[PDB]
Amino acid sequence: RDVNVFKKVLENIGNAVTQFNNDILAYTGGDANHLIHDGDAIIKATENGLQELGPQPPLSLTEALALVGPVQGVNKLIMKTVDHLIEKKGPLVGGGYGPQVKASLQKQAHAAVTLSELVSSKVPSPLAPISKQLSDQVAQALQKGIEAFSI
């Protein structure tokens, strides 16, 4: 269908986030450069999404509904992933990675906000409050991560 481009961007982004989550969970201290590279892969997937979805025609009501569940799933994953990252603050700051993590999150927040805005423009107005809720979830979680890796 149409919705398929939207599905794929979502899968892409999900996969990148899953990768990052798995590495954060495995991480106990030491070299974290693979985590910063994981972060970059997420940002790249988000930016690619901007380009692929940009020219897309808006979704029908029933098309967008079919994507609500999947988006919620990735939004749960993003939330959990940020929490895991915050739980590894000690080791990361101890390794001197604090500033890089902060920056990577800041960059991620910007890409995410811009992607969610583009996406909201593609969903019918009756769903607008649901897009907003979904988009806030991500925004809040990243912000929470940014505050945690501050000073």
Side-chain angles (χ1 to χ4, degrees):
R1 187 50 287 154
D2 247 330
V3 310
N4 269 337
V5 191
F6 285 87
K7 276 186 196 186
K8 304 278 164 88
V9 173
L10 186 69
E11 280 165 24
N12 259 317
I13 293 177
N15 286 343
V17 179
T18 286
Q19 178 60 231
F20 185 53
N21 195 39
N22 293 346
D23 290 344
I24 300 174
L25 282 166
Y27 180 81
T28 55
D31 204 309
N33 279 290
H34 67 298
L35 296 179
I36 279 96
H37 284 260
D38 285 353
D40 291 342
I42 297 172
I43 295 174
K44 187 81 191 167
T46 306
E47 293 173 337
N48 287 354
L50 275 170
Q51 294 301 122
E52 303 200 67
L53 296 183
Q56 218 59 38
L59 292 150
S60 79
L61 194 77
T62 61
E63 277 163 20
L65 284 167
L67 292 166
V68 172
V71 173
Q72 189 51 90
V74 168
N75 272 196
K76 221 165 180 196
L77 171 65
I78 288 164
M79 288 175 135
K80 268 157 32 183
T81 305
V82 169
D83 282 347
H84 291 335
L85 181 71
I86 294 170
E87 282 162 14
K88 291 293 200 265
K89 186 193 158 147
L92 281 165
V93 173
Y97 290 97
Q100 282 115 293
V101 173
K102 193 198 190 203
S104 197
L105 287 168
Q106 272 158 346
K107 193 174 191 218
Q108 283 171 357
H110 181 56
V113 67
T114 67
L115 173 63
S116 65
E117 264 157 23
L118 173 76
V119 173
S120 303
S121 76
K122 306 266 171 205
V123 320
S125 57
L127 276 52
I130 284 154
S131 320
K132 183 202 177 159
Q133 189 196 312
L134 284 169
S135 172
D136 284 345
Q137 269 163 28
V138 181
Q140 266 148 228
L142 291 173
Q143 192 49 43
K144 174 205 247 186
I146 290 170
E147 283 157 9
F149 281 82
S150 276
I151 44 168

